[PDB]
Write a protein that binds this DNA or RNA. Structure first.
Ligand SMILES: Nc1ccn([C@H]2C[C@H](O)[C@@H](COP(=O)(O)NP(=O)(O)OP(=O)(O)O)O2)c(=O)n1
Ligand SMILES: [Mg+2]
Ligand SMILES: [Mg+2]
Length: 430
DNA sequence: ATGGTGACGCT
DNA sequence: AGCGTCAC
C-alpha cells in the first residue's frame, strides 16, 4: 500500500495525426477537402495500393492495403491522390517534410520522441509543474478542454456524442482536487490543457488536425489517443485502468499486436489485458522471459517506465523497392540500374540531412530478397559509407551482394531478386 | 501483387 | 554483425 508504486509519476502525451498523408494532399488540393478520398501508390496494378484513407471514405469500408479498383467498388465517388514517383519508385518526400512541420511545432512545447512519420510522444511532467505554479490553486474551466474526453466518464447516477463528452468532462472536473499540486489526476488535467494548446498550434500553423492521448506513460497515452480519433484528445487516468482493461483485447496494447500477444492469449487462456493481473510476476516471466514478464506484470496494472527519448530525427535513412512476381530482377544490368536508382534517391536525402542536421551517416546496409524465400529480408550485409556518392554507394552495394548470384552464366541473376533496400545508418556529428 | 518505410531486441 | 518482431 504505502510502498506500492502506482506509475503516476509522469505526464505523457502521444500526438497522432489524423489520416495524415490524406490531410497533406487535401491541404495542397482544396478539391479533396471534406471528401471521401485516399492516397494511392502505383496506378498500373489494380489502380494502385491505398495507403491512407479519409474518414469520409472509411464510412464506405475503404481501408489501407486495398487496391483502388476494389475501393472504387465500395465508394464509386472516391477521390484519389497519388504518391510522387521519382527514378521509377514511390518517393515519400512530401510526407516527410510535412512531418517535420508538425514535429518542429510540438518541440516548442516539450522535448519529443518521434515515434513515426505522424506521431510523437511528449513528456509534459515539467511543463505541467510549471503551469500548476501559475494556476495558483485556481480551478480549471471546461472551456480550457474543448476537445477532451475523460475515459470512463460519465458514469453513475442527452443522447448525442458532444453531450456525453461534456457530461464526462464536468464529472471529472467537479471531482478534481485543485489545491493539491502533487495530485496525479490534476497533473493529467493540466497535461490535457497543454495538449489542447499544442493541438491548436499544430492546426493553426499547418492546417493539419490530430488526436492525442494523455496519461502517465507511453502505452496508455497511445491507447488513449485512438479512443476518440479523429480530431479529439483523450485523458486516461490511473483510476480508469481497471475498467478500461477489463474488456480490452490484449492485441490492442502497443507491442502485443503480433506473435507475443498471441502467445499470451494462447498460453494463459485469456482474452483481455485486465486478466493479466491474476498471474505473478514470476509466472509471467516464466512464459515470456524476464523482460517481457516484468513489463506485462506492470502494464496490466497501468504501469510502464519506458521513457520519452529525446529524439526528433530518424536514426536511419533508407530507400527500398519490391519487384514482385514476374517483375523480379533476372539480369545483372537490372540489378545495377535499380541499385543506382535507390542510391541516387538516398544520396539526395543524405545530402539534405547533412546540411539540415549536422550529421553524416557512416554505415550502408544492403538488403535483398530472392524469389522463393517468404521472409521480408533474405540477406543483409553492411559496408562503410564514406562518401555521399550514388555511383559509389551503388557499386559498393553490388559488391557486398554479388556472391548471392547462384547463376553460372555471367549476366543473369539467379534466383531473381524480389526486393532491394539501401539504408544509411550509424550517424555521427559533422 | 498493398509497398515503402522505421525502431528496437536477440544471439 | 545479421536476423527477427512490431508498427506507422
Ligand atoms: N501500413 C502503413 C501505415 C501508415 N502509413 C503512412 C500513411 C498514414 O497516413 C500515415 C500515418 O499512419 P497511421 O497513423 O497508422 N494512419 P493515418 O494517420 O492515415 O490515419 P489515423 O487512423 O491515424 O487517423 O503513415 C503507411 O504508408 N503504411
Ligand atoms: Mg495517424
Ligand atoms: Mg500514426
Amino acid at each position: 500500500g504505502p510502498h506500492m508504486a502506482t506509475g503516476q509519476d509522469r505526464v505523457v502525451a502521444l500526438v497522432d495525426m489524423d489520416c495524415f498523408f490524406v490531410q497533406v494532399e487535401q491541404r495542397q488540393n482544396p478539391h479533396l477537402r471534406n471528401k471521401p478520398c485516399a492516397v494511392v501508390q502505383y496506378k498500373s496494378w489494380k489502380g494502385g495500393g491505398i495507403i491512407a484513407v479519409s474518414y469520409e471514405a472509411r464510412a464506405f469500408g475503404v481501408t489501407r492495403s486495398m487496391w483502388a479498383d476494389d475501393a472504387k467498388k465500395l465508394c464509386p465517388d472516391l477521390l484519389l491522390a497519388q504518391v510522387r514517383e521519382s527514378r521509377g519508385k514511390a518517393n515519400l518526400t512530401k510526407y516527410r517534410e510535412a512531418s517535420v512541420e508538425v514535429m518542429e511545432i510540438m518541440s516548442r512545447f516539450a522535448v519529443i520522441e518521434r515515434a513515426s512519420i505522424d506521431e510523437a510522444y511528449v513528456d509534459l511532467t515539467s511543463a505541467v509543474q510549471e503551469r500548476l505554479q501559475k494556476l495558483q490553486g485556481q480551478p480549471i474551466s471546461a472551456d480550457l478542454l474543448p476537445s477532451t474526453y475523460i475515459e470512463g466518464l460519465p458514469q453513475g447516477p442527452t443522447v448525442q456524442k458532444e453531450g456525453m463528452r461534456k457530461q464526462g468532462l464536468f464529472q471529472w472536473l467537479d471531482s478534481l482536487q485543485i489545491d493539491n499540486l502533487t495530485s496525479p489526476d490534476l497533473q493529467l488535467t493540466v497535461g490535457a490543457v497543454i495538449v489542447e494548446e499544442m493541438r491548436a498550434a499544430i492546426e493553426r500553423e499547418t492546417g493539419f488536425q490530430c488526436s492525442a492521448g494523455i496519461s502517465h506513460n507511453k502505452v496508455l497515452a497511445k491507447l488513449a489517443c485512438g479512443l476518440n480519433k479523429p480530431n479529439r484528445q483523450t485523458l486516461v487516468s490511473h483510476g480508469s485502468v481497471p475498467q478500461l482493461f477489463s474488456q480490452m483485447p490484449i492485441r490492442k496494447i502497443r507491442s502485443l499486436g503480433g506473435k507475443l500477444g498471441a502467445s499470451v492469449i494462447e498460453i494463459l487462456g485469456i482474452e483481455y489485458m485486465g486478466e493479466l493481473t491474476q498471474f505473478t510476476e514470476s509466472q509471467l516471466q516464466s512464459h515470456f522471459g524476464e523482460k517481457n514478464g516484468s513489463w506485462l506484470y506492470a502494464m496490466c496494472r497501468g504501469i510502464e517506465h519506458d521513457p520519452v527519448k529525446p529524439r526528433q530525427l530518424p536514426k536511419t535513412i533508407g530507400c527500398s523497392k519490391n519487384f514482385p512476381g514476374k517483375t523480379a530482377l533476372a539480369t545483372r544490368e537490372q540489378v545495377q540500374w535499380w541499385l543506382l536508382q535507390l542510391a541516387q534517391e538516398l544520396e539526395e536525402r543524405l545530402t539534405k540531412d547533412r546540411n539540415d542536421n549536422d550529421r553524416v551517416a557512416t554505415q550502408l546496409v544492403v538488403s535483398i530478397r530472392v524469389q522463393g524465400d517468404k521472409r521480408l529480408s533474405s540477406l543483409r550485409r553492411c559496408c562503410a559509407l564514406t562518401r555521399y556518392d550514388a555511383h559509389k554507394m551503388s557499386h559498393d552495394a553490388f559488391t557486398v551482394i554479388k556472391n548471392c548470384n547462384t547463376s553460372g552464366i555471367q549476366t543473369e541473376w539467379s534466383p531473381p531478386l524480389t526486393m532491394l533496400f539501401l539504408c544509411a545508418t550509424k550517424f555521427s556529428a559533422s
